[PDB]
Amino acid sequence: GAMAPSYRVKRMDIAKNDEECVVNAANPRGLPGDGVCKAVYKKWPESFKNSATPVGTAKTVMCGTYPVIHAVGPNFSNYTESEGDRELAAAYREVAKEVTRLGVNSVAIPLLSTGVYSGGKDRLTQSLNHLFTAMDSTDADVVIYCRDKEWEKKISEAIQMRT
Numbered sequence: 001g002a003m004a005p006s007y008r009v010k011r012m013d014i015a016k017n018d019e020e021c022v023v024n025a026a027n028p029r030g031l032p033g034d035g036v037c038k039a040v041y042k043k044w045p046e047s048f049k050n051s052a053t054p055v056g057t058a059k060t061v062m063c064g065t066y067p068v069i070h071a072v073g074p075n076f077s078n079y080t081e082s083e084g085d086r087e088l089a090a091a092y093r094e095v096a097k098e099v100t101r102l103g104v105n106s107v108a109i110p111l112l113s114t115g116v117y118s119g120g121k122d123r124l125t126q127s128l129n130h131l132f133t134a135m136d137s138t139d140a141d142v143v144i145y146c147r148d149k150e151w152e153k154k155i156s157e158a159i160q161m162r163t
């Protein structure tokens with residue numbers, strides 16, 4: 001575990017993280033995909049061997065000794081708000097189990113279902129709160145990655161609010 005488990009946010013490519021493992025915002029079929037998923041494919045292509053896994057689950061595949069936790073959030077284009085919300089909460093609970101099993105002291109995480117799977121809606125608060133619900137009981141240092149300068153501010157504010 002980390003000595004004083006924390007949350008942090010960084011606005012940068014998650015493929016250049018400084019943590020002991022990465023969560024991929026995966027598709028169910030283990031395809032190279034777009035956005036975060038394509039950056040993870042470029043950096044850790046070996047981790048996409050048998051990475052396909054259903055919506056609401058996480059599957060870890062090693063790239064060398066570096067763990068890539070493929071977490072499949074729902075595509076809100078296909079899911080109802082209600083069923084989508086349930087699967088998004090579940091994907092994060094499966095991430096917390098994997099981070100715990102691996103015994104890592106740190107993890108790089110994106111906000112699941114906030115990219116092309118958002119169905120166009122702003123889901124910062126919805127996705128971040130499910131991230132907290134899952135990860136609050138883990139003792140890994142969590143480093144949340146985003147692209148948008150204003151999302152970085154909003155995520156930083158939400159972390160500091162609890163401190």
Ligand SMILES: Cn1c(N)nc2ccccc21
Pocket residue numbers: 025034035036037110111112113114115116147
């Ligand atoms: C959440 N997310 C994913 N998964 N891919 C992205 C690309 C750009 C911005 C945000 C993104």
Ligand SMILES: Cn1c(N)nc2ccccc21
Pocket residue numbers: 114115118120121122123148151
């Ligand atoms: C930055 N950002 C992401 N990642 N998804 C969004 C949806 C609406 C507005 C802004 C959004």
Ligand SMILES: Cn1c(N)nc2ccccc21
Pocket residue numbers: 012013014015035036039110111145146147
């Ligand atoms: C496109 N993209 C990469 N490459 N890393 C990201 C982290 C968060 C959101 C979007 C991201």
Ligand SMILES: [Cl-]
Pocket residue numbers: 011012013016
């Ligand atoms: Cl960057």
Ligand SMILES: [Cl-]
Pocket residue numbers: 025073112113114115116117118
């Ligand atoms: Cl997404």
Ligand SMILES: [Cl-]
Pocket residue numbers: 146147148151
């Ligand atoms: Cl973003």
